[PDB]
Amino acid sequence: VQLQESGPSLVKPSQTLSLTCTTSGFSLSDNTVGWVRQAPGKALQWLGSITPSGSTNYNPGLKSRLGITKDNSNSQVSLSLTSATAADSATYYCTTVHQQTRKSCPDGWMFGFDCGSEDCVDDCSDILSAQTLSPIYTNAYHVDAWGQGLLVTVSSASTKGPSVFPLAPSSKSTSGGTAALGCLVKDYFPEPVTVSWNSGALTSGVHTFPAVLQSSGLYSLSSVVTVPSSSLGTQTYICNVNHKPSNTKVDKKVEPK
Amino acid sequence: QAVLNQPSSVSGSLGQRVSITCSGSSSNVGNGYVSWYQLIPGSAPRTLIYGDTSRASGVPDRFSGSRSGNTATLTISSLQAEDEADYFCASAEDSSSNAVFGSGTTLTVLGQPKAAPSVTLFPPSSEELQANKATLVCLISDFYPGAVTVAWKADSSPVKAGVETTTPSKQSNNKYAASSYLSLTPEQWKSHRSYSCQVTHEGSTVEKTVAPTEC
């Protein structure tokens, strides 16, 4: 199954954050879809879900700001939150929720089958003059599938694409048979950026570091890869930076010195 | 928006057993039907347990859930290095379709082989210099435990301004990596004769040096 979130990575304060989840592999009319978020370094927070019948449930502390919509034909769920503040900067996940209705009788009461069957009775020895009631159905929920999530930043500062500079290997950056090389992704906003190497064909020995917020207010990070030193004249190495907040993709050839 | 209570962090050695508790009242955990989720950085959350004790698809047998009234427990037996993650419990309050998540627990897997770090110091590229900027990039990788201190030098004199350092984080091979930056102007860069990145790790200090009069 697949759940893909989409929307703006940057929302100005007091504006309305809006995200859309495109679904495939379960039909939006059978299973129910919910939204979960998590602020950086905080715990998961339930935002709400929409039932197959179109009914919506919201978190009690955020219902005045939330709103979920459905479109079964296009298979798209929508989430909205008004008066977006800096506390709303988080990663927003699109999920599928699964329910499970359990029937039960009130306390002390018993079923007719355990002794007319579906009803709960007050006395099984009589099963006639005893008081009769209906069973109580209560359902529980668990999240089954999670989307990759979308990092949303609530800020007044403006988007800025990244500058990509090469971290080239030299006669001092080597370590015998292996050499380290990378590219520096400088001055971008907001988060995040994604780096690969040779269009994903180079995954062995790759690491991308967490970003850092500079004094200028922009983010920067690095991505490094270790390759055989004997290949620095035969194999070309390209780092593929991706910045969805600005719809920018940069391919930078790393040349040995 | 009640927050179920979990310990902020637990620990355990390789191959040993670890338990994570999830405290609640009689109206959300006391009802039962508690689920557990695993969050590894760089990955989407992974549903481990649902309905107190049932495993999800593709969940190994070392992951097991249980409940005892108002406190449910997730137990991970034969501990592995890939089990280092954040774990969250959850339950619906009075079956109102709204669910509450736990405070979260960070798991640490100890007993892993110690490793000394390798350090690489890149001088500012020609492209960055042509843009009237200069950033020294000090990359540290393949070390355990993930505790290092980074110092910058200019002609052996300490430098504390214009330095940014990331907190150590896990690599793909369960070892740690960190990065440090020294943002200078091209005039500051061409000024001194050398700049150094000093990395201290377990009674050892590796120093890498770059000179503007080089490659």
Numbering used by the authors:
A (entry chain H): 2 to 82, 82A, 82B, 82C, 83 to 113, 119 to 259, 262
B (entry chain L): 1 to 9, 11 to 27, 27A, 27B, 28 to 95, 95A, 95B, 96 to 106, ...
Recite the paper's sentences:
The cow antibody repertoire contains a unique subset (~10%) of antibodies possessing ultralong CDRH3s, which can reach lengths between 50 to 70 amino acids. The unique CDRH3 structure can be separated into two microdomains where the antigen-binding disulfide-bound “knob” sits on top of a long b-ribbon “stalk” and can bind to both surface and receded epitopes. Ultimately, we isolated a total of 8 and 11 cross-clade nAbs from cow-485 and cow-488, respectively, all of which had ultralong CDRH3s, suggesting only ultralong antibodies were responsible for cross-clade neutralization detected in sera. BnAbs from cow-485 were named Bess, while bnAbs from cow-488 were named ElsE and assigned numbers based on their order of discovery.
The ElsE Fabs all have CDRH3s with 54 amino acids and 4 cysteines, with a 1–3, 2–4 connectivity, Bess7 has a 61-amino acid CDRH3 with 8 cysteines (1–6, 2–5, 3–7, 4–8 connectivity), while the 55-amino acid CDRH3 knob region for Bess 4 (6 Cys, 1–3, 2–5, 4–6 connectivity) has no ordered electron density in the crystal structure. Ultralong bovine CDRH3 knob regions fold with 3 short β-strands connected by 2 loops (Loop1, Loop2) of varying lengths that can adopt a multitude of different secondary structures, including loops, helices and β-turns. The ElsE series of Fabs all have highly similar knob structures as expected from their high sequence similarity. Flexibility in the stalk is evident in a comparison of the ElsE family of structures that have similar CDRH3 knob sequences and structures, but very different orientations of knob domains with respect to the body of the Fab. The ability of the knobs to twist and rotate with respect to the body of the Fab likely enhances the ability of bovine Fabs to access recessed epitopes. There is no convincing electron density to indicate tyrosine sulfation modifications in any of the antibody CDRH3 regions; however, BLI experiments indicate that Bess7, with 3 tyrosines in CDRH3, contains one or more sulfated tyrosines. Low sulfate occupancy or flexibility in the CDRH3 knob region may explain the lack of electron density for these groups. The ElsE lineage was the most potent and broad overall.
